[PDB]
């Protein structure tokens, strides 16, 4: 039926699919490096290193296919919260997207190694050669971030990741398949294409729908101008699968081909000295330039719905590629051969390959893509939100990243006035879909209104007002006792024998338990922390009804207690210890608006690092932030904590020190240029995610949407008006909350009315 074209048979090792004719294969999932983050200077170096690592493993056995598959991603699912405010935010932000691109690029490289008690040892030799080739390629692609596709057991049904890509090549829709005892050629196809016998266009046959696709063959010989030439296709309104193959030629074969070409060009009736000398230069450039040639066909298979729409897509692609000095030749009768040539190891069905230098293959497919992140499959459900980007590609933001268990710590370096608090509120509100506990810490009441809207119990603090804290009412567990001992020592230090006294006193010492009572059991120094003393309002309170079970979110404001070196370390130990006691099983998070002040704590920093090592496998997501990096890098330990971070988000800070971004944060010089390029209040930010970056331009201004066939204008101006927090905003919120009650959504309309009156 259809297996007459598909060569795949079965697995030979976890990461190497075999072939019918014994042509072992491997599949790599290449994320690709961003071609916007780095200037034109480093692109050439990228191409050169890829050339080096290719010619390093050059052999006549090897080959390479390369595919740039574009999708209209549907695997990003809508999520329903349990709070009306977050639902409002999500609904308007999603409605901000009617008419956008919503397309992701995926880049796949496949390496196939076809050989040209001896038999068993040769089987072992073949697989060992291919695995060594894989190791070298992996060493090469470290910056690009590729992952080796390998089997993954799903509940006793072993599967095989490489089959999925080869399926998408033919099926056109990601249909998972299991590894089973057949030869995969029989059932790897599910939705078999139906090419019109004249061959201008095609068809697809799915359970849920169908499509039409016409092709283009990009046969180019001239050396490319840009190291990525036809990358204009990476941004277009149509789907495609752009395919290149590099069936290498053994060095004598390349020499012979160049010699025959030069001879047949000489033995003609017209002399063209613009060609003969160039070819003769290349012939002994091959020996001394060290690049190995090979076969190469290029085919672009645009998809569509209406056949006329497919022709419009082809005309648009032809124009947009004539703009880059390449002439597309439409395919009319070769379409069946072209499409069945997309499958790796289908050398036979290539329409008309012609030898191409290695530099030109790596410069036609250099693995450039606009950074877009993972739409789904993350360790924490789908991506939290879908940021826009300059040049129109949807960045699917997430703290997951990949290998800076899964590292999730995130830092948000930028000025607080310039959209830091708005961004943090937006991210937390739209990441409420996970239902994780958020332990918010704040500076200058940044997030009070946002947290109180999200159904937390944000506790505003205040100097001289009873804090309500009473650590001595903790249950007398071994851990709490140790803490209290350390805690009281720290209080006493504000003013070995002392230690013994404190220990005996704490051991000896529920409703009656207070710091003042402790004095009855160092005494003179603790008096100031007791009722009637300078700090008696903090820890000597009669009661302490403060456990994390009642709510999911809590926020603690220490902007009152920020720059007062007496007891930041005590209060931070207490908050961290009590919150850490709650850390089991629950999907967990921290938020630190500013951390460098608690960072210079001697006792707390070691505990933080050890707890980090313990938590990295326990769904821990720190979300650090800083108003200006020079504040952070002033402290040495801050560099140690910054080295352990997953995703960096960079706001617009014109007043940015060169050294800090350049070597402190492992940024590039070009990225440092892009940071300064943003205006004072640009509302864009460069997200260095892993080892690739893009300008995630977020804009919550006026937008047009279609409701019931009419264009209506809407906005998020209101949301950012309620999202950000100001002291007048805080006092209005406190007055309302005091008078109306507790429930989150009962007061919000009243708040809207009062804030509207303030704005007038």
């Amino acid at each position: 039926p259809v297996g007459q074209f598909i060569p795949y048979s079965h697995h030979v090792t976890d990461t190497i699919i075999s072939t019918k004719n014994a042509e072992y294969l491997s599949v790599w999932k290449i994320d690709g490096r961003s071609h916007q983050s780095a200037s034109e200077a480093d692109v050439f170096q990228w191409i050169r290193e890829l050339n080096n690592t290719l010619r390093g493993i050059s052999s006549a056995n090897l080959s390479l296919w390369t595919h740039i598959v574009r999708r209209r991603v549907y695997e990003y699912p809508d999520a329903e919260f349990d709070n009306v405010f977050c639902r409002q935010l999500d609904e308007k932000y999603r409605e901000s997207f009617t008419g956008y691109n919503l397309m992701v690029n995926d880049l796949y490289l496949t390496v196939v190694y076809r050989p040209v008690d001896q038999k068993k040892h040769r089987q072992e030799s073949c697989i060992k050669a291919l695995e060594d080739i894989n190791r070298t390629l992996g060493q090469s692609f470290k910056r690009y971030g590729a992952e080796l596709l390998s089997v993954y057991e799903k509940g006793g049904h072993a599967f095989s990741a490489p089959l999925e890509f080869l399926a998408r090549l033919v099926n056109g829709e990601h249909i998972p398949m299991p590894i089973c005892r057949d030869r995969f050629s029989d059932y790897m196809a599910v939705n078999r294409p139906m090419f019109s016998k004249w061959g201008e266009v095609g068809e697809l046959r799915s359970l849920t729908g169908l499509r039409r696709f016409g092709m283009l063959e990009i046969r180019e010989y001239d050396d490319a101008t840009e190291p990525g030439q036809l990358n204009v296709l990476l941004e277009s309104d149509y789907e495609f699968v752009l395919t290149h193959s590099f069936s290498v030629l053994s060095r004598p074969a390349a020499k012979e081909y160049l010699q025959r070409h030069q001879k047949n060009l000489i033995d003609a009736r017209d002399v063209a000295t613009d060609q003969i000398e160039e070819i003769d230069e290349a012939l002994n450039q091959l020996i001394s330039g060290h690049f190995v040639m090979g076969e190469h066909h290029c085919t672009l298979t645009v998809y569509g719905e209406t056949v006329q729409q497919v022709r419009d897509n082809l005309a648009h692609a032809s124009a947009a590629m004539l703009d880059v000095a390449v002439l597309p030749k439409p395919v009319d009768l070769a379409l069946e051969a072209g499409y069945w040539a997309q499958l790796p190891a289908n050398w036979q069905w290539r329409p008309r390959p012609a030898p191409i230098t290695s530099l030109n293959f790596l410069s036609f497919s250099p693995f450039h893509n606009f950074m877009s992140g993972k739409p789904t499959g993350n360790p924490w459900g789908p991506a939290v939100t879908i940021l826009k980007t300059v040049s129109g590609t949807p960045l699917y933001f997430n703290f997951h990243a990949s290998k800076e268990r899964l590292l999730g710590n995130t830092m948000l370096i930028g000025q607080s006035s310039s959209g830091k608090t708005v961004l943090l509120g937006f991210l937390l509100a739209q990441a409420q879909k996970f239902k994780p506990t958020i332990v918010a810490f704040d500076k200058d009441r940044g997030m009070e209104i946002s947290i109180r809207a999200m159904g937390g119990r944000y506790l505003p603090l205040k100097t001289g007002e009873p804090s309500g804290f009473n650590p001595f009412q903790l249950p007398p567990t071994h851990a709490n006792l140790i803490f209290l001992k350390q805690f009281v020592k720290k209080l006493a230090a504000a003013g070995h024998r002392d230690e013994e006294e404190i220990d005996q006193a704490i051991t000896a010492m529920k409703s009656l338990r207070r710091l003042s009572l402790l004095l009855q059991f160092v005494h003179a120094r603790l008096v100031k922390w007791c009722e009637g003393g300078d700090y008696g309002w903090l820890f000597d309170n009669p009661t302490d009804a403060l456990d994390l079970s009642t709510h999911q979110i809590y926020g603690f404001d220490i902007t009152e207690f920020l720059d007062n070196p007496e007891a930041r370390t005590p209060v931070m130990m207490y908050l961290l210890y009590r919150t850490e006691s709650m850390i089991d099983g629950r999907r967990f998070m921290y938020v630190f608006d500013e951390f460098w002040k608690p960072l210079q704590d001697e006792y707390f920093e070691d505990l933080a690092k050890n707890k980090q090592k313990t938590i990295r496998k326990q769904n821990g997501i720190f979300v650090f932030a800083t108003q200006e990096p020079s504040d952070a890098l002033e402290s040495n330990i801050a560099k140690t904590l910054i080295q352990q971070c997953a995703t960096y988000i960079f706001l617009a800070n014109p007043k940015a020190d060169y050294e800090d971004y350049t070597q402190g944060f492992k940024l590039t010089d070009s990225e440092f240029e892009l940071v300064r390029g943003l205006g004072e209040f640009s509302r864009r930010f460069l997200i260095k995610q892993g080892d690739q970056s893009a300008l995630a331009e977020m804009n919550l201004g006026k937008f047009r949407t279609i409701v019931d066939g009419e264009t209506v204008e809407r906005d998020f101006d209101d949301e950012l008006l309620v999202l950000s927090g100001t002291p007048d905003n805080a006092e209005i919120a406190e007055s309302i909350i005091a008078e109306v009650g507790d429930d989150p959504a009962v007061w919000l309309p009243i708040f809207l009315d009062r804030v509207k009156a303030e704005r007038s």
Partner: peptide
Amino acid sequence: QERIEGEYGASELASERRPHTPGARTLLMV
């Protein structure tokens, strides 16, 4: 299994026919 809708099939030129001068047949036969 049928020709794919809305594509360029065979030519529309095969429909052409050579016209006969409407006296050639009768007098040629006689």
